[PDB]
Swiss-Prot record, chain A:
Organism whose genome encodes this protein: Severe acute respiratory syndrome coronavirus 2 (2019-nCoV)
Lineage: Viruses, Riboviria, Orthornavirae, Pisuviricota, Pisoniviricetes
Function: Precursor of the fusion protein processed in the biosynthesis of the S protein and the formation of virus particle. Mediates fusion of the virion and cellular membranes by functioning as a class I viral fusion protein. Contains two viral fusion peptides that are unmasked after cleavage. The S2/S2' cleavage occurs during virus entry at the cell membrane by host TMPRSS2 or during endocytosis by host CSTL.
Consequence the record notes for mutating N16K: In strain: Omicron/BA.1, Omicron/BA.2, Omicron/BA.2.12.1, Omicron/BA.2.75, Omicron/BA.4, Omicron/BA.5, Omicron/BQ.1.1, Omicron/XBB.1.5, Omicron/EG.5.1
Protein's recorded name: Spike protein S2
Name of encoding gene: S
Impact after mutating D48H: In strain: B.1.1.318
Domain of life: Viruses
Consequence the record notes for mutating D48Y: In strain: 19B/501Y, Omicron/BA.1, Omicron/BA.2, Omicron/BA.2.12.1, Omicron/BA.2.75, Omicron/BA.4, Omicron/BA.5, Omicron/BQ.1.1, Omicron/XBB.1.5, Omicron/EG.5.1
Length: 49, 49
């Protein structure tokens, strides 16, 4: 069946490319939402607000 | 059975097995390079892509 499927490598490459694009897009979404600032501030030890 | 000198030649024998390959046909129609799919991970990636 794999030997018969070899002639559909274009289709399967297209599918894998689409899914890879989706995955990279998800990583990009998370980064652009949360990593707005690249200075990791830490809260002061004392709580006087 | 004793009065004979050997030649000065060498040969090599391999063994074909069922394997999937990638081949590159140049502008003149000759094969110039190939990839042994299922040899190492890098060739596997070249073969999948
Ligand atoms: C293809 O054939 C022509 C004439 O034989 C030659 O000039 C040319 O170099 C060949 N192509 C390459 C990449 O060598």
């Amino acid at each position: 069946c794999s030997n018969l499927l070899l002639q559909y490598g274009s289709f399967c490459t297209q599918l894998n490319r689409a899914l890879t694009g989706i995955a990279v897009e998800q990583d990009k979404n998370t980064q652009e939402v949360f990593a707005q600032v690249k200075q990791i501030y830490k809260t002061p030890p004392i709580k006087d607000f | 059975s004793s009065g004979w000198t050997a030649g000065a030649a060498a040969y090599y024998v391999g063994y074909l097995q069922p394997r999937t390959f990638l081949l590159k046909y140049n502008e003149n129609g000759t094969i110039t390079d190939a990839v042994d799919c299922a040899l190492d991970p890098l060739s596997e990636t070249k073969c999948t892509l």
